[PDB]
């Protein structure tokens, strides 16, 4: 099951996610769509038969979802589609297309063994913006830490490497948090011996691909 790449939308918009199907009789099996909304658990949205395309949408997503089937003798071929209108802020998460994998006939129509690679969708009022870098200068007795503060950027992700590589010891790149401004921010610290200050150079490399922003930030003690 192959879906489209990651997509980001504005609130009140719509998103079309495809789901390539092969290696199984599509007309006899179903394709369910399940989204993983963070801290809320897996949510089943609906399934789609390949025969006549009967659909069963979840009640709490009416007038927002619509699933269409595509087909083509090697039958198996075809693509499933998920349309998600009425985008809010709480619809951000991983959206999977799931299907009962090649196994037993006893397996019900909800025992999904096969899962797609997943489609990440982020919906907010924010726009693409390069990150700002603030150095976290180490304090002033034995093994102190230093790091970089990646604040105000959108969207995910950001890759942080130290000294252009060759420095992957005690490095902690924390997961991003969503501020009230609607922009992400995270920290990336590195623990370092207090005797190696002033003699060793410490440089962090913050990269932001979606806004084509690259930053080589240096950190000096106080």
């Amino acid at each position: 099951l192959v879906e489209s790449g990651s997509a980001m939308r504005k609130p009140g918009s719509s998103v079309k996610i495809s789901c390539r199907a092969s290696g199984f009789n599509f007309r006899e099996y179903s394709i369910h769509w399940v989204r993983l909304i963070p801290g809320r658990g897996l949510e089943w949205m609906g399934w789609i038969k390949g025969m006549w395309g009967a659909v069963n949408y979840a009640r709490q997503l009416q007038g927002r979802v619509s699933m269409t089937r595509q087909l083509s003798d090697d039958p198996d071929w075809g693509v499933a589609y998920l349309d998600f209108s009425g985008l809010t802020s709480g619809d951000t998460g991983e959206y999977f297309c799931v299907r009962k994998g090649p196994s037993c006939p006893h397996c019900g129509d909800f025992h999904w063994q096969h899962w797609g690679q997943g489609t990440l969708v982020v919906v907010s009022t924010a726009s693409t913006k390069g990150p700002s870098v603030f150095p976290l200068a180490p304090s002033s007795g034995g093994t102190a830490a230093l790091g970089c503060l990646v604040k105000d950027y959108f969207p995910e992700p950001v890759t942080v490497s130290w000294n252009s590589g060759a420095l992957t010891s005690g490095v902690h790149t924390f997961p991003a948090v969503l501020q009230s401004s609607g922009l992400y921010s995270l920290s990336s610290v590195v623990t370092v011996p207090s005797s190696s200050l002033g003699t060793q150079t410490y440089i962090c490399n913050v990269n932001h691909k979606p806004s084509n922003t690259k930053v080589d930030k240096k950190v000096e003690p106080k």
């Binding site: 658990g41 897996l42 899962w115 180490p138 830490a145 503060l149 902690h172 790149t173 924390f174 501020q179």
Partner: protein, 207 residues
């Protein structure tokens, strides 16, 4: 139909036996089990109460009847520590997370004053580190001139670093430039459990 997964988080040593629950509201049916490791899509383990799928070790043992169900892992592997969901048709559980248990670890609390380059943006952010600790139950307070903050700081804790199964966390206190220049002392009280005294790292405005 309500699927209640308890306890939500379980600390198990690599080799011990884990036991998850899935007490449903309406019985007379079966239950499935799904495993999800971070970075990879959820995987089916058990379907129809107690039946394994293709390419699944026998250490995963399912059982239960009526409303009470249970997933048991005989001798937990180091790759079994993940998020587990149970399913009845369309309904799921909130999920339980298998945790690597270890001895307690005192966090090394560090504090970082906002850069002068940052102050030119009109805002100021001071952060705490307290990296490498166990378990992930910490309490950062943020006190500026003996004044407690509540609603202007965000923390971010990393998952267990497999090389020692420890945490980190990072609380960031963000303020404006005007409010930052008004005060002097910026503290960071940390109440874990390692050492009976709450470790506090602070700095005064200037240097």
């Amino acid at each position: 139909i309500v699927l209640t997964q308890s306890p939500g988080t379980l600390s198990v040593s690599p080799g011990e036996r884990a036991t998850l629950f899935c007490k449903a509201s309406q019985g007379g049916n079966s239950l499935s089990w799904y495993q999800k490791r971070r970075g990879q899509p959820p995987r089916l383990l058990i379907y129809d109460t107690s039946r394994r799928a293709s390419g699944i070790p026998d250490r995963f043992v399912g059982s239960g009847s009526g409303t009470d169900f249970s997933l048991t892992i005989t001798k937990v592997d180091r790759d079994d520590f993940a998020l587990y969901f149970c399913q009845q048709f369309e309904f799921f559980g909130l999920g339980t997370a298998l945790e690597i248990n270890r001895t307690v670890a005192a966090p090394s609390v560090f504090i970082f004053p906002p850069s002068d380059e940052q102050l030119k943006s009109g805002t100021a952010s001071v952060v705490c580190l307290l990296n490498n600790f166990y378990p992930r139950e910490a309490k950062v307070q943020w006190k500026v001139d003996n004044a407690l903050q509540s609603g202007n700081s965000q923390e971010s804790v990393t998952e267990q670093d497999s090389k020692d199964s420890t945490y980190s966390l990072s609380s960031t206190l963000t303020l404006s430039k005007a409010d930052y220049e008004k005060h002097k002392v910026y503290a960071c009280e940390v109440t874990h459990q390692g050492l009976s005294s709450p470790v506090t790292k602070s700095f005064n405005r200037g240097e």
